[PDB]
Coordinates of C-alpha atoms and ligand atoms in Angstrom, one line a residue:
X1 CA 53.1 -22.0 59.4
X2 CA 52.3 -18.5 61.2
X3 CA 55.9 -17.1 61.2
X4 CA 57.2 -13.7 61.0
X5 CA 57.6 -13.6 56.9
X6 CA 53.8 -15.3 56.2
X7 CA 52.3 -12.4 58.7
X8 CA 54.0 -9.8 57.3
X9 CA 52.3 -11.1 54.0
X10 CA 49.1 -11.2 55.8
X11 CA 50.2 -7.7 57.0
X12 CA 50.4 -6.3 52.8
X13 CA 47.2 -8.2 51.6
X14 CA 45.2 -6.2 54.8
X15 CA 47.3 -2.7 53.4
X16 CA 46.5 -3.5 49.9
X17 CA 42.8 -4.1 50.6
X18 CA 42.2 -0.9 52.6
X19 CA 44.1 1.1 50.1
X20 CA 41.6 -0.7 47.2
X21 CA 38.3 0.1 49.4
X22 CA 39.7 3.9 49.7
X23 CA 40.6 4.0 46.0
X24 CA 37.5 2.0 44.1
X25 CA 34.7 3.3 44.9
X26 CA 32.3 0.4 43.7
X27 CA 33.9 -2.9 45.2
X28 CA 32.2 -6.1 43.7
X29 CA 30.9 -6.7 47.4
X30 CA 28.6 -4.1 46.3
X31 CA 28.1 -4.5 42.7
X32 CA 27.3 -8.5 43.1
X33 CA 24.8 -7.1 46.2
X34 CA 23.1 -4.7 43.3
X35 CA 23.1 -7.9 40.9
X36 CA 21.5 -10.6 42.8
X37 CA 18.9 -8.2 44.6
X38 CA 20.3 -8.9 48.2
X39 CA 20.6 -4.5 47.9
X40 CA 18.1 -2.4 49.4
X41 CA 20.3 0.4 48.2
X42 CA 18.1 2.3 45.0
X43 CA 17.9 -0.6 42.0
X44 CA 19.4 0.8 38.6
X45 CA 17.7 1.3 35.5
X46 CA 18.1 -1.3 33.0
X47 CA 18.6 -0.3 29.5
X48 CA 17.8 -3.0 27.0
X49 CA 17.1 -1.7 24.2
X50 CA 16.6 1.9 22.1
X51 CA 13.6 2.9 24.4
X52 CA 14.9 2.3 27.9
X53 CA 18.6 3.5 26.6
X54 CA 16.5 7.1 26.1
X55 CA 14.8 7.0 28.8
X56 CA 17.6 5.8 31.2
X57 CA 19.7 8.9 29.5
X58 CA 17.2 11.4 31.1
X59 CA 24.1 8.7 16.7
X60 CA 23.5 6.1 19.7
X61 CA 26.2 3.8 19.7
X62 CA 28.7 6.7 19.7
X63 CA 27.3 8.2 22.3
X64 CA 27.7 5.3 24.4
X65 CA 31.5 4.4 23.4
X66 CA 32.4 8.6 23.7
X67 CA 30.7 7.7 27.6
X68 CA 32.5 4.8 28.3
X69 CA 35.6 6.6 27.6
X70 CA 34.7 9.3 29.7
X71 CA 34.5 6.1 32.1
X72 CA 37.6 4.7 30.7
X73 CA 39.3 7.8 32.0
X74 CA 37.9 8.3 35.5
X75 CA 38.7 4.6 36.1
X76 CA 42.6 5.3 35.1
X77 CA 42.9 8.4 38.5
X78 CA 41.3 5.6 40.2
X79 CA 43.6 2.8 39.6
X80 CA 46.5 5.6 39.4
X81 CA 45.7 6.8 43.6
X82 CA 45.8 2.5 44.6
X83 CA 49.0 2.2 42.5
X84 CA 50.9 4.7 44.9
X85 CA 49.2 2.9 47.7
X86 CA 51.6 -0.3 46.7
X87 CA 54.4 -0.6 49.2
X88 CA 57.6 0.4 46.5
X89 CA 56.1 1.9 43.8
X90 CA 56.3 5.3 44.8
X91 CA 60.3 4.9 45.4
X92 CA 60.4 3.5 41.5
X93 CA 61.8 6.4 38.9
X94 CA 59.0 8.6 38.2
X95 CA 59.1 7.1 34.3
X96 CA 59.3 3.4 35.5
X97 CA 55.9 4.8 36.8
X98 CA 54.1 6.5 34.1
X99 CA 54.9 3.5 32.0
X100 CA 54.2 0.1 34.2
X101 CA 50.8 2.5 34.5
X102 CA 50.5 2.9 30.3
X103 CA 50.6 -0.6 30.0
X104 CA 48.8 -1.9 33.2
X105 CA 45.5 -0.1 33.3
X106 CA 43.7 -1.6 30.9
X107 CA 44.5 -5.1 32.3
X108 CA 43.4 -3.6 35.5
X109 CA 40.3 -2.3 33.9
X110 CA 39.0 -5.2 32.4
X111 CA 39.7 -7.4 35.3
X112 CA 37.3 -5.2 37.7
X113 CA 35.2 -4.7 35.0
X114 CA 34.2 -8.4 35.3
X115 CA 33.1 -7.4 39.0
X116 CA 30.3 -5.3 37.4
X117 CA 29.5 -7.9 34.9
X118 CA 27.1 -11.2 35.1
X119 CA 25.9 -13.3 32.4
X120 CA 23.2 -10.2 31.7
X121 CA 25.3 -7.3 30.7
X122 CA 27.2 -4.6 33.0
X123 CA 26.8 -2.2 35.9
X124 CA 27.0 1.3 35.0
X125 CA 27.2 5.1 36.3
X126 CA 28.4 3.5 39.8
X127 CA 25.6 1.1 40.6
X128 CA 22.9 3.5 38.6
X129 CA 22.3 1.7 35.8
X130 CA 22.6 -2.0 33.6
X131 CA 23.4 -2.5 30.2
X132 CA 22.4 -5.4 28.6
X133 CA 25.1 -7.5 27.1
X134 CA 22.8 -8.4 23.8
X135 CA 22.0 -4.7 23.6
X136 CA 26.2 -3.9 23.4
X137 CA 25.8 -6.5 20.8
X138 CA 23.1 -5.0 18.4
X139 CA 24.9 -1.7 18.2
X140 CA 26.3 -1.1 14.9
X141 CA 28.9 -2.5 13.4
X142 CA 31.6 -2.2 14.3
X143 CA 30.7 -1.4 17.8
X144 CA 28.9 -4.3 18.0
X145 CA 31.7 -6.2 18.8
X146 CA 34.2 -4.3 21.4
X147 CA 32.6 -5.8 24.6
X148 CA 31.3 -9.0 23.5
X149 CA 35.1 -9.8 24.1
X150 CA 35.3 -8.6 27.7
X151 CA 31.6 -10.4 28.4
X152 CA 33.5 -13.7 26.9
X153 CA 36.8 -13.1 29.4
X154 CA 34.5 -11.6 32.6
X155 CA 32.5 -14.9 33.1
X156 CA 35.1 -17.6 33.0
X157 CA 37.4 -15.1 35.1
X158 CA 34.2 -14.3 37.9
X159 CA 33.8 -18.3 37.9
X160 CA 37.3 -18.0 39.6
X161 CA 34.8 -16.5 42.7
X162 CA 37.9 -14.1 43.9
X163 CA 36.6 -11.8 46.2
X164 CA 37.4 -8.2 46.8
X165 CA 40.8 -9.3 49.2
X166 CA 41.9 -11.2 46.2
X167 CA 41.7 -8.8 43.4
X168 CA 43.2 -6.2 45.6
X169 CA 46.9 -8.1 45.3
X170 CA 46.0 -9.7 41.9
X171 CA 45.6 -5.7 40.5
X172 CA 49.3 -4.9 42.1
X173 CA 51.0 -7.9 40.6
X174 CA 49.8 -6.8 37.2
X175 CA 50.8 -3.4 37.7
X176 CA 54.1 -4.3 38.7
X177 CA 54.8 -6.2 35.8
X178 CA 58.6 -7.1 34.8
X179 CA 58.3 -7.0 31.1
X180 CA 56.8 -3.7 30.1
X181 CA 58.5 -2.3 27.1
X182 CA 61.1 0.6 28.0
X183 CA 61.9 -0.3 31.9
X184 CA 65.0 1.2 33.1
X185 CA 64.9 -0.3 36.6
X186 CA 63.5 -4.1 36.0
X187 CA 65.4 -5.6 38.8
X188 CA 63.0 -3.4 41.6
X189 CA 59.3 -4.4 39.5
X190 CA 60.5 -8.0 40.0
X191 CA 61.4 -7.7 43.8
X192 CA 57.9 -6.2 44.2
X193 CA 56.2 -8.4 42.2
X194 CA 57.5 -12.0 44.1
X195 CA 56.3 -10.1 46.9
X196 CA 53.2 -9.9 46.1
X197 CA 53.1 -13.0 44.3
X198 CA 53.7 -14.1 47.6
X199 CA 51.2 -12.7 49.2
X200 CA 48.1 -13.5 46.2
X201 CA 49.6 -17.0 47.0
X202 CA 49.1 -17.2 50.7
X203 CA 46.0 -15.0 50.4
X204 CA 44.2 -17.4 48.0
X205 CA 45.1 -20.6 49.7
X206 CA 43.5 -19.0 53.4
X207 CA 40.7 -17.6 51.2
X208 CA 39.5 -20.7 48.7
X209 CA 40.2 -24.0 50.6
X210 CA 38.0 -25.7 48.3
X211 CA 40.1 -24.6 44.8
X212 CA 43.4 -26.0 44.1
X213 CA 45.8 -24.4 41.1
X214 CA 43.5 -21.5 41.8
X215 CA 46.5 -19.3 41.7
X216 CA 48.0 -21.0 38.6
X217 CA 44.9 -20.7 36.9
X218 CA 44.2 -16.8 38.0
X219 CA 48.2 -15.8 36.9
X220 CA 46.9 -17.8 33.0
X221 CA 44.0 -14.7 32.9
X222 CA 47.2 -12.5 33.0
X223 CA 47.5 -13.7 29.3
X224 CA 43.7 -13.2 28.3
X225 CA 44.3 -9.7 29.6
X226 CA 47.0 -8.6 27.3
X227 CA 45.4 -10.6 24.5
X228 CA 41.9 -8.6 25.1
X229 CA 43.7 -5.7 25.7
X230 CA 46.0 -5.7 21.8
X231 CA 42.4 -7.0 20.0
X232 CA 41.1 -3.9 22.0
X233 CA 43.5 -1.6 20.6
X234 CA 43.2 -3.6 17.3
X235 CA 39.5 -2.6 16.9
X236 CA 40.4 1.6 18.1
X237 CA 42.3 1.2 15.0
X238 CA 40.0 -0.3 12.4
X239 CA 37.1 2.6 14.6
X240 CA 39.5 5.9 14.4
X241 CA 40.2 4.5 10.9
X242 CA 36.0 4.0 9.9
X243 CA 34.4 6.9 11.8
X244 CA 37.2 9.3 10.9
X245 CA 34.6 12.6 12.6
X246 CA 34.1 11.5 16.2
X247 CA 36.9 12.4 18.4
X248 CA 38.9 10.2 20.9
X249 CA 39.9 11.3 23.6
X250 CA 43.9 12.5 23.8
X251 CA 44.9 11.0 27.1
X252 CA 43.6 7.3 25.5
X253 CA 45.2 7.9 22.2
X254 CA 48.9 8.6 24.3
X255 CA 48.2 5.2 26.0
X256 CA 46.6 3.3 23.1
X257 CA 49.8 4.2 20.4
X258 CA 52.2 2.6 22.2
Ligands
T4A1 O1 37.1 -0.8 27.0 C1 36.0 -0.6 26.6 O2 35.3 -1.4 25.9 C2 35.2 0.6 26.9 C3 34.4 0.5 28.3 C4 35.0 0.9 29.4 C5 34.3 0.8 30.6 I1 35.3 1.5 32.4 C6 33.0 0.3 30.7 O3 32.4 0.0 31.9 C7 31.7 1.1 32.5 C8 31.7 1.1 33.9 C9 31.0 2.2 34.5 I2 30.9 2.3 36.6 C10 30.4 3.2 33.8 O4 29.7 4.3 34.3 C11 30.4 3.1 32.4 I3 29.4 4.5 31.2 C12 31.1 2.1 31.7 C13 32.4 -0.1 29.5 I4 30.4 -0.8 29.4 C14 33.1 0.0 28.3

């Protein structure tokens, strides 16, 4: 039914969408658009192996990780600007903040990530360019290995077909999650977060009339996340621990050491 409490639902999912358009810049409206050729917006340049990977950039696999978390950074003042936008956060203690943010982004990341991905490899450099997903592969060990597991995650989570309304109020759940270690004020998250369950709930059911448990099976990639996210961290590790002479980069390293 169309009552008060379902449109002011309807209401937050609209709020949360505009706030997610304002905030991230390339929506998978676009980046699909960009994948499937339907764009007549400039085609990017498609590096797929050594040759096109120099000639796109007018040791390798370095380069490219020390890149990505160059990436991995702007990505974070994105996510950071839609995370104010949420309707409560802002009224949170400032240190609830900073730490549902230390634990969520990378959740966050990886699930918009997917929106860049298709069975080929990855959008990069805002539409500008592809990386092939075999390419990511033949780097060198043992770089060869810290997509694969987001490639393996992004296709059985875009078969989910959510659109850019749907990840919208699927990014604030996560944020506001109830069960990041050292929350002082755990009562609040959870308030929030039934909200917005709420909403995801409603907004998936008007959105995806052909998909049932939809929204049981999208709150189950909650737990992929987290698990990509530790093997992620896992792999950092085993990195900062091989190639002990690149740097990484201190903002990731507060994040990553908690
Ligand atoms: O966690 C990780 O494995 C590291 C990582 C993070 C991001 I974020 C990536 O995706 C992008 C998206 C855009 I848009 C870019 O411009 C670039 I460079 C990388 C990739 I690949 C790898």
């Amino acid at each position: 039914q169309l009552n008060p409490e379902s449109a002011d639902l309807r209401a937050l999912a609209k709020h949360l969408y505009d706030s997610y358009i304002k905030s991230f810049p390339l929506t998978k409206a676009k980046a699909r658009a960009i994948l499937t050729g339907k764009t007549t917006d400039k085609s990017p340049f498609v590096i797929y192996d050594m040759n096109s990977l120099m000639m796109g950039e007018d040791e390798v696999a370095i380069r490219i990780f020390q890149g990505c978390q160059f990436r991995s950074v702007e990505a974070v003042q994105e996510i950071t600007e839609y995370a104010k936008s949420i309707p409560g956060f802002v009224n949170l203690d400032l240190n609830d903040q900073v730490t549902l943010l230390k634990y969520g982004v990378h959740e966050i990341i990886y699930t918009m990530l997917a929106s860049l991905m298709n069975k080929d490899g990855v959008l990069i450099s805002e539409g500008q360019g592809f990386m092939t997903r075999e390419f990511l592969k033949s780097l060198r060990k043992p770089f060869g290995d810290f997509m694969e597991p987001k490639f393996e995650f992004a296709v059985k989570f875009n078969a989910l077909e959510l659109d850019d309304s749907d990840l919208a109020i699927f990014i604030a759940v996560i944020i506001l999650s109830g069960d990041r270690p050292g929350l002082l004020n755990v009562k609040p998250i959870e308030d929030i977060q039934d909200n917005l369950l709420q909403a995801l709930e409603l907004q998936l059911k008007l959105n995806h009339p052909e998909s049932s448990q939809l929204f049981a099976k999208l709150l189950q990639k909650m737990t992929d996340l987290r698990q990509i996210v530790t093997e992620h961290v896992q792999l950092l590790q085993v990195i900062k621990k091989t190639e002990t002479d690149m740097s990484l980069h201190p903002l990731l390293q507060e994040i990553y050491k908690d």
